[PDB]
Amino acid sequence: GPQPISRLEQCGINANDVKKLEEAGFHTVEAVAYAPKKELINIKGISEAKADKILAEAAKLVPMGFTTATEFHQRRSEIIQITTGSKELDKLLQGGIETGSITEMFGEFRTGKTQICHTLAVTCQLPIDRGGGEGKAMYIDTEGTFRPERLLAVAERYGLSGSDVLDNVAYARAFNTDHQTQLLYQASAMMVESRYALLIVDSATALYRTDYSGRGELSARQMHLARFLRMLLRLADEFGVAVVITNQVVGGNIIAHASTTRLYLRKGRGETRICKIYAEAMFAINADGVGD
Amino acid sequence: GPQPISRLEQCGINANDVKKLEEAGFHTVEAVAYAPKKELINIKGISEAKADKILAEAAKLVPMGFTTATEFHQRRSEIIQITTGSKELDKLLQGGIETGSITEMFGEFRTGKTQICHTLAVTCQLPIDRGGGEGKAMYIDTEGTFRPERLLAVAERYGLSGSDVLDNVAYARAFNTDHQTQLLYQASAMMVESRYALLIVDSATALYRTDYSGRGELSARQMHLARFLRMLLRLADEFGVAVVITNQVVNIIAHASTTRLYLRKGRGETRICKIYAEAMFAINADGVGD
Amino acid sequence: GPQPISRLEQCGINANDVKKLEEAGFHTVEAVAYAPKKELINIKGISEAKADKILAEAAKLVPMGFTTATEFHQRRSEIIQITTGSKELDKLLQGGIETGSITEMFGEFRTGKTQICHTLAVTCQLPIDRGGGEGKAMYIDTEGTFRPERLLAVAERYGLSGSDVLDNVAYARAFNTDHQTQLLYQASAMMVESRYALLIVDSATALYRTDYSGRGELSARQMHLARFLRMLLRLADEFGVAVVITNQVVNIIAHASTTRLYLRKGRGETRICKIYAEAMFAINADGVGD
Amino acid sequence: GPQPISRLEQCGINANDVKKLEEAGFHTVEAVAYAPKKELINIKGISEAKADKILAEAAKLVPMGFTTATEFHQRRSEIIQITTGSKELDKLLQGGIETGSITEMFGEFRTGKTQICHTLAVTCQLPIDRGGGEGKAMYIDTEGTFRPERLLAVAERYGLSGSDVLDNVAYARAFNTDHQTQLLYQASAMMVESRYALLIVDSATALYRTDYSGRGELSARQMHLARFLRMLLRLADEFGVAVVITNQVVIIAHASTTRLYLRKGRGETRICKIYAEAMFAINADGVGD
Amino acid sequence: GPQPISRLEQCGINANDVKKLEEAGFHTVEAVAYAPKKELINIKGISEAKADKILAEAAKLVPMGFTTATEFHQRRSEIIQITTGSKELDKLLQGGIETGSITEMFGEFRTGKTQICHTLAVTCQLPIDRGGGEGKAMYIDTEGTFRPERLLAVAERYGLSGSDVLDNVAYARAFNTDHQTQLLYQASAMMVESRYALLIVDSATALYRTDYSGRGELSARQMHLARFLRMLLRLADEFGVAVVITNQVVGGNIIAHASTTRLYLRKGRGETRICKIYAEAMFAINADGVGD
Amino acid sequence: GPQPISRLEQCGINANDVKKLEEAGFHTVEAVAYAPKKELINIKGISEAKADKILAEAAKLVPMGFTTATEFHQRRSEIIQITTGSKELDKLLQGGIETGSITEMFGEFRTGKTQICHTLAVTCQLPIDRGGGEGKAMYIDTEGTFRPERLLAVAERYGLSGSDVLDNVAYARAFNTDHQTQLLYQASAMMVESRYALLIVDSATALYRTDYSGRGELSARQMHLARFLRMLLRLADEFGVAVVITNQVVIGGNIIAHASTTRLYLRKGRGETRICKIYAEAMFAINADGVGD
Ligand SMILES: Nc1ncnc2c1ncn2[C@@H]1O[C@H](COP(=O)(O)OP(=O)(O)O)[C@@H](O)[C@H]1O
Ligand SMILES: Nc1ncnc2c1ncn2[C@@H]1O[C@H](COP(=O)(O)OP(=O)(O)O)[C@@H](O)[C@H]1O
Ligand SMILES: Nc1ncnc2c1ncn2[C@@H]1O[C@H](COP(=O)(O)OP(=O)(O)O)[C@@H](O)[C@H]1O
Ligand SMILES: Nc1ncnc2c1ncn2[C@@H]1O[C@H](COP(=O)(O)OP(=O)(O)O)[C@@H](O)[C@H]1O
Ligand SMILES: Nc1ncnc2c1ncn2[C@@H]1O[C@H](COP(=O)(O)OP(=O)(O)O)[C@@H](O)[C@H]1O
Ligand SMILES: Nc1ncnc2c1ncn2[C@@H]1O[C@H](COP(=O)(O)OP(=O)(O)O)[C@@H](O)[C@H]1O
Ligand SMILES: [Mg+2]
Ligand SMILES: [Mg+2]
Ligand SMILES: [Mg+2]
Ligand SMILES: [Mg+2]
Ligand SMILES: [Mg+2]
Ligand SMILES: [Mg+2]
C-alpha cells in the first residue's frame, strides 16, 4: 500500500536530504505529494530548486490527477470495514468501523466508549473473512485506562492466541497536549514498517482540558486541536487506518467537521447501552468485550 | 532510582539553571519530560532556546515513544499491592492498594477511613513478601486526627520495631488550602532522596470546604483542587507510589480516582466496605485485621 | 513560644503594614504563615507584592515542611495536660483536659458544666508538677453566670493566694453574636505578652439561639459559628491554649472538636461524665471534688 | 519659561512667520528648540532653510549643551513644592506636589481626589513663604465636578480675599477628546502673559472611556493619550508649572513622576498610598486637618 | 439661548450638509462644537475638509476657550432651580431640582416617584419669581403611568389654567430601547424650537430590564444605557433643561458618574414618604400633588 | 382598523417576508413598529438592510413621536369601559373594566371570579350606549371551568339571542404553558380578522403551578410568565382590547404586579354577599342569571 520515501531518491542526495523530510513529519512519498509547497519550504536545508525537484519527483510516483467515478467507486469498495463484536452494531454501521475515516465516540461517564475501544483493538487482528483487517492496533491513551488483561478475555472468545495478540498492539500513554503530536510522528514511521488497522486515540480531549484552564488560552487550544485533527485526516489517507477518537461530552464543534462518523453513547433505564449515529442498536458489555 | 534531575546537566544546561527548574517543581527528569513546553516557558529565566534544549535532552534519558502491549503487561505485573489487613478478606482489591494510582476513600464520619490509613502507613514499610512496599510512608494530615500512638500499637502486631516505624513516617499537617499544594512541591524533592511507597492525604477537601466558604468562589475551588489532583497523578507515576485520599460524604473531581472505596456503618463494630463487592473488616485496638 | 508579629518587619513597612495586619487579627508570625493569600490580599492596603513578601518572610521564621513522627511524638508529648480537679475524672481523660484541643462539654442545665469551668479556671494557675500550666484563664461568659466568689473559695482549697488568683483570670461578658467574634481577635492580641493556658467560652451557643428568630437565617448562623470554632482551632493550635466549649443541650460544632464530656446527671448529687466511660466526682462549695 | 516666541523675531525671521508658527502650538522659543526638525517641517509655509535658521536662532537663545551635576542639583533645589494640607502632613512628599512633573492620582469613587485638586487650586496662590506657588492655577474639568463655592470656602480657611482667589483660577470644561488638546494649546498660549503654577485635569481618562466606546479603537485611544501626556510633559518642562492628573480606577506609567493612590479609609479619615501612608480628612473647608 | 444650525451657513451648503447634521442628531451649533471630529466623519456625505470647515465655524460661533472662575461662578448663579411643591423638599434641595443636571430617583414601589415627577411637570411651567422656569415638560413614559387628570388637579391646586398646562406638557410613550434614543433625537428639535425646562424619563431602566433578559446581553445593555445617559447629559448641557430620571430599585453602579443628584425614596411607615439626598426630609402625597 | 401588516408590502418588502413576519408573531405594522431591532434581526431570514427597511416603512405609517398632553387626554376619554353587572351600584372602577389595560383578579376559591368572567364575556357584546364593548371576547380556560350554559343564562338575562352570544366567544382551553403563548400568537391574527373587545384568562398561573413543580426551575417559570405578561401588554395596548387575568390566592407584589395596572381582590364574605376591594369596597352577589342582584 503505502510507499516509503526511500523510493524518492533520484539525485536527491540520500541520507542528507531524506531525513530532513523524515524529522519534518513526512515518512511516505505520498505524504510529501499531499503536502503543500510552503510545508517543504519552511523545512531548513531545502532550497526552492530542491523542494521543486522533490515535489516533481513525488508527483511522478503517485497519481494526483483526475479519475472517473467508476474507478473511485471500486476504490471506495473493498474497504476493510472492521467489525466491532456486536451483531446489532455491525448491522448499524454496515460492517463496523470503516478505514480511512475518523470515527468519534461520545458519552457521559462509564458509557463503554473506552470498553468498546478494547474489543476493537483485538478484532482488528482477525482475518478479512471474519471481520477485521488482520493488522495491528496502535492504542493511544491519555487518561490512563489501558488494561491488557481485558484483551486476554476478549481474544479468548475469538479463538486467537493470547500471546500473539498483545505483540501486535502498541501503547503510547500520552502525557501532554504536545506529546500527542510527536506520537503521530513516531506513528507514521511505524505505519510504514508493518500493516496497521487502528489508531485509537482514547480520550483525545482529556489532555487539552487539564492544561488549558486559562480563559485566554481557548484560541491556542483550538488551533492545537485543529493541527492534531488535521494530522489524523492525512495519516488515515496514505495508510488506510480506521482512526477512532474517544471524546467526553460533559455535540458539534471544531472536532466535528474533521470527523466522518459519530457514535454518541449513553446508558438506558432498560436493557442498557444503546448507540446513535448522531439510528439505534443494541449492545452490552460482558466479560469478553461487547456482546448482544 | 527514578533518575534525579542532577543527571541532566551538560555544557549548555548551565547547572545554575537546574536549581531554577528545581524551584519550579520539577525535581525529576521524568517530570520535565512529562512537562509540556508551555510550563517550561512560564518559568522565569528560561528562554525558548533553553527550554528546547532541556526538553530535547530529557527526551533521550527516558522512554517517551511507543512500546508493545506485552511489555506493558509485565510492567503491570510489578505492582506492590500494599496489604491492608481485614478489608482484603477474599482480596476485594486483588492483592491490596494499587500502587502508582490514587485510591480515593469515602464515609460519613467515625467510619474508619482515617484508621486504616494508620494501618496502611505501617504495612507499606513491611517486606514485600509479607505484603509491604519496602519503603517508608508519608502522611499529610488535614484535620488534625493524626495519632502517632496508633502507629506503635499496630506496629507490635506485625513485630516491626517501634522505633523504626515513627522515623519512617513523614508527617506534615496542612493548615491551608495552598499549603497542601506546596507540600507536594516539597514532596517531589523528598521522594528522590529515599524510597516512598505510600502517600496519604487525611482529607483532600477539609480545608477546601472550610477555607473556600464563600458563595461566589465555587469555581475557584474547582481548578485549585484540580491542580492538587493533577500533581498527585504526576507524583503517582514517576515514582510508583501509592496515593490514598479520604473524603467526607454528607475538569471534575471524579476523573482522577483510578479506584474508589466507599465505607458504611454496619451493626455495631461490623464495619462495611464497598467499591463504586463488600467485605467484613473491623477496627481492633491493634490495627484493622480481625 | 509564639513569635510576635513585629519580628516580621524587614523592609515590611513598619506601623503601616504590620499595623494593617494587626487589625486583621494576625498578631503573630504563626498566624500569617497559617493564613492563605486570600485574606492577606483581602485586607485593604496590601498589594500582591506586599502579600507575597510578608508570606515569604513569615515562612522563613516558622517551620512548614515535613517532620518525622519521632519529632511529632515528642512534640505531642510534654503537653501541658491541664488537670480537672477530680482524680477519678483525671485518669479517665488520662490527665484531664489537654491543650491544643477544643474540649467541648454538654448537659441539660445545672449539670456542673459551669461548675467545673470555675474549678478548671482556678487550676490553670497551678505549676506543672501538680496540674495546670501556670497560666491565666480567659473566661468568656455569654449567659451571665461567672461568680468570682467561687474562685476565691476554691483558691483556699488548693492553698493558693486569694488575691492573685482573680488578678490572673480575664472576663469578657459577650452580648452580641458579633461581639463574640471580635473578642477572639482581642484575645489573640493580649495572648502574646502573657503565658495563657485556658480559654473557657462557657455558653458558646446559648448566645446564638437568642438571635435565632425565624427559619430564614439557619444557613447564616451555621457559617458564623463555623468560623467561630475555626478561629478557636486556629488560636489553640499556635498558642497552645486549652480551649473549652460549654454547650447546652435540650460540619458544625461536631468536626472541629477533639474531646467531648457529656454530663448526663446521676443520683441528684452523684454527678457523672461521658466521653461520648463514667467518672465519679462530687460538687461542693470549694470547686468540685477529687 | 519667561522666554517668549516674540524675541525670536529678527531681520530674516519675517515676524509674520512667528505668527504663522504660533498656531502650531509653539509660543516660547524653548518649545521650538525642544522640537525636532520634523515638528517644524510639517508646518505649512516653512521652508527647509527657514526651519534651519529658526532652530539655529533658538539654539543661540536657549542653551541645550551639557551642564555640571552641581548646577543641576542647585536648579532642582529651586522646586516650589506646592502644599496640600493633610497629605503632606508628616512630610510624605517632602514639601508637596513638585513643579515640572506630572503627579498622577487614582481612586475608586468618592475617594477625595477632586476635593484635594480644589484645595491645591487655592493653595498654589499662597505666597511661597507659606507654602504656595505665587501663581494662578488652571482647571480643566471633564466630568463637570467643578464648584467655585468650595474654592471660596477653602480660601476663607487660609485667609485670602475671595475675589482675587477666584479670578486667578482659569476654568475650561472639555467635552471632546480633541478639545483637551486644543485646551492645552490655548494653555501654552496663555501661560506666557501671566505666571501660572498649577495645571489641574479633573479626569484625563474620563473622556477616553466614553468617547471611544468600542469597535476596537484601543490603539487610537492609546496614542491619543500618549500625545496628550507628551504635550503635558512638554508644557510642564518648558513652563515649570506643576501638572496634576487624576484617573478613575475600575501610557500613564512612564510620565507620572510621582504617583498617588487614594482609597477609602474610616469615616472622614482616608488613607493615601504612594504607589508611604497618611491620614487626609476631607473637611467642609478643605483637606488640612 | 441655544443657537440653531441654520446659522452655520458660510459656504456650508444648506439642504445638503446642514440637513445631514440634522438627521445625524445634531440640531444646534453648540451640539456640533461639543462633538468630536469622528462624530462628523462617520456621517455619510461629509468629507474631512467639510468637517474641518463645520468645526471651525462652530468654534468661532460659540466659545470653547478658557474662562475665569468668577465668570463661571456668576454662571452657576441664575440657575433656574425649579421648585417641587414641598417646602421640606424645597429646603432640602436648596431650591429644588437644578437645570443642567440629571436628578436620579430610587424607590421600591408605590414610593411616590411618578407622583413627584407629575408635580415637577406641572410646576416647571410656573414663572421664575415663584418656583419653576416657565418652560415645557416632556414626560417620557416607558411603563404607562401618565395620568393627565392628576396634572389637572395639581394645576388647579397651583392656580394655573388647566388648558395651558396640558398644552405645554409633551408625551412620548417609549416602547423599545432604541425608541428612547430616537425620542431624544426628536426632543432636540423641540429643544431648539421652544423654551423647555423638564425632560422626565420616568422608568428609564424598565425597558432595559424587560427586553434584555438574556444573560449574554449585559454588555450590550450597559453600552446602550451608557450612550443614553451621555445623550441626556449632552442635551442638558446644550439646552439647560432639568433632566429627571426615575429608576426601580428592586444601591449604586455605572450610571451615577453621569448622574449629579439622587433622591432615594422610602415608604416611611409613620407619616410616610421620607426621602434622602443619598440628609432627610418628609413629604406627603395628597389628592393634589405633594404637600407637607 | 389597527393597521393590518398586509399593507406594509411595498416593492422592496418581498411579501413572502410578510408571511415570515406573520409567522414570527407580528400581525400588524403597529406590532413591528413597537418591536425592537434586536428581535427583528433574530427572525431567521431577515437581513440587516431588510430589517432597516421594514422598520423605516413601519415608522412612517404609525405615529411614534411626541404628542401634546391634550391629545393624550382626548385619546384617554374614549375607553370602552365594559360593564360588569351587579357592581353597577357604587362604581369602584368608574364604569367597569378598563379597555386596553389588564385588570388582574384574585380570590381564594368558590369566590366567583370565574362567574363574573362569564358576565364580562357576555357584556363585551353589548352596544356602547348600554355599557358594552361592541365586540367579541376570548375565553382562555386553564382549569376546565368554562360553561356555555351560564353564558346562555346571562345572555337571556340581558335579553341577547343565544346564537349571537355563542358565535362570538373564542374558547380555547390550555393544556400547557407554551400553549398559552401559541394561543396568543394565534389570537394576534384573530384580532385583525374581526373586532375583539375582551380577552379573558381563566387562570394565568394554573398551568405554571402544575407543570413546573420542581425547586429547580423557579426562575424559568418566572421569565416564562414575564414573557406571557409582556405579550399580553403588547396585544392589549396594540389592539385596544380589555384583558382580565384571574389568579389563585393561597399574594401581593411580584412579577405580575408591575404588568397589571389594576387589581380586584375578592373575599368570600357573608355568604351570598361577596365583597370586592381593589388593592374601596363593593358588595355583589352571584345569582343563577349571572351577577346582577
Ligand atoms: N468484565 C466486565 N464485565 C461486565 N461489565 C464490565 C466489565 N468491565 C467493565 N464493565 C462495565 O463497563 C463500563 C466501562 O466503562 P468505561 O468505558 O471504562 O468508562 P469511560 O467511558 O468513562 O472510560 C464500566 O462501567 C463497567 O461497569
Ligand atoms: N481501640 C479501639 N477499639 C475499638 N475501636 C476503635 C479504637 N480506636 C478507634 N476506634 C474506632 O475507629 C474509628 C476511627 O474513626 P476515624 O476514621 O478517625 O474518623 P474520621 O473518619 O472522622 O477521621 C472510630 O469511630 C472508633 O470508633
Ligand atoms: N455551695 C454549694 N453547695 C451545694 N450545692 C451547690 C453549691 N454550688 C453549686 N451547687 C450545685 O451545683 C449546681 C450548679 O449549676 P451549674 O451546673 O453551674 O449550672 P449550668 O448548667 O449553667 O452549668 C446547682 O444545681 C447546685 O445545686
Ligand atoms: N462639606 C463636606 N464635609 C465633609 N465631607 C465632604 C464635604 N464635601 C465633600 N465631602 C466628601 O468629599 C468627597 C468628594 O468626592 P470626590 O473626590 O468629588 O469624588 P470623585 O473622586 O468621584 O470626584 C465625598 O465623598 C464627600 O464625602
Ligand atoms: N389622589 C391621591 N391622594 C393620595 N395619595 C395618592 C393619590 N394618588 C396616588 N396616591 C399615592 O401615591 C402613590 C404613587 O405611587 P407611584 O409613585 O405612582 O408608584 P411607582 O413608584 O411604582 O410609579 C401611590 O402609592 C398612592 O398610594
Ligand atoms: N345559581 C347560583 N346560586 C348561588 N351561587 C352560585 C350559583 N351559580 C354559581 N354560584 C357560585 O359561584 C361560584 C363560582 O366559583 P368559580 O369562580 O367558578 O370558582 P373558581 O374561582 O375556582 O373558578 C361557586 O362557588 C358557586 O357557589
Ligand atoms: Mg470508556
Ligand atoms: Mg472515621
Ligand atoms: Mg455547672
Ligand atoms: Mg472622590
Ligand atoms: Mg412612582
Ligand atoms: Mg371561584
Residue numbers in the entry:
A (entry chain G), E (entry chain C): 21 to 270, 288 to 315, 323 to 336
B (entry chain F), C (entry chain E): 21 to 270, 290 to 315, 323 to 336
D (entry chain D): 21 to 270, 291 to 315, 323 to 336
F (entry chain B): 21 to 270, 287 to 315, 323 to 336
The authors write:
Homologous recombination (HR) mediated by ATP-dependent DNA recombinases, such as prokaryotic RecA and eukaryotic RAD51, plays an essential role in the maintenance of genome stability by repairing double-stranded DNA breaks (DSBs) and related lesions. ATP is required to form an active RAD51 nucleoprotein filament and each protomer of the filament engages a nucleotide cluster. Although it is not required for strand exchange, ATP hydrolysis is involved in the filament disassembly, which is required before repair-mediated DNA synthesis by polymerase.
We report the cryo-EM structure of ADP-bound RAD51–DNA filaments at 3.1 Å resolution, revealing a unique RAD51 double-filament that wraps around ssDNA. Closer inspection showed, surprisingly, that the hRAD51–ADP structure forms a two-start helix, containing a hRAD51–ADP double-filament wrapping around ssDNA, unlike the conventional hRAD51–ATP single-filament. The refined helical rise and twist shows a helical pitch of 145 Å and 7.4 protomers per helical turn with a diameter of 108 Å. Although the individual filament of the hRAD51–ADP double-filament extends the length ~24% compared to the hRAD51–ATP filament (from a helical rise of 15.8 Å to 19.6 Å), it takes two filaments to form hRAD51–ADP double-filament. As a result, the overall filament length is reduced to ~62% (the helical rise changes from 15.8 Å to 9.8 Å). The protomers in ATP-bound and ADP-bound states undergo minimal overall conformational changes, with a root-mean-square deviation of Cα of 0.9 Å, indicating that major conformational changes occur only at inter-protomer interfaces, not within the protomer. Upon ATP hydrolysis, while the ADP nucleotide is still bound to the Walker A motif, the loss of γ-phosphate eliminates interactions between Q268 and D316* and further destabilizes the R130 interactions with Y315* and E322*, resulting in loop Y315*–E322* moving away from the adenosine moiety of the nucleotide. These local changes open up the inter-protomer interface with a rotation angle of 19° and extend the hRAD51 filament. Taken together, the movement of Loop 1 and Loop 2 in the ADP-bound state dislodges Arg235, Val273, and Asp274 from inter-triplet spacing allowing the extended ssDNA or dsDNA inside the filament to transform back to the original length. While the central cavity of the hRAD51–ADP double-filament remains positively charged for DNA binding, the wider cavity (from 98 Å to 108 Å in diameter) and lack of Loop 1 and Loop 2 interaction gives ssDNA greater mobility inside the filament, resulting in weak and diffused ssDNA density that can be observed in the cryo-EM map at a lower contour level.
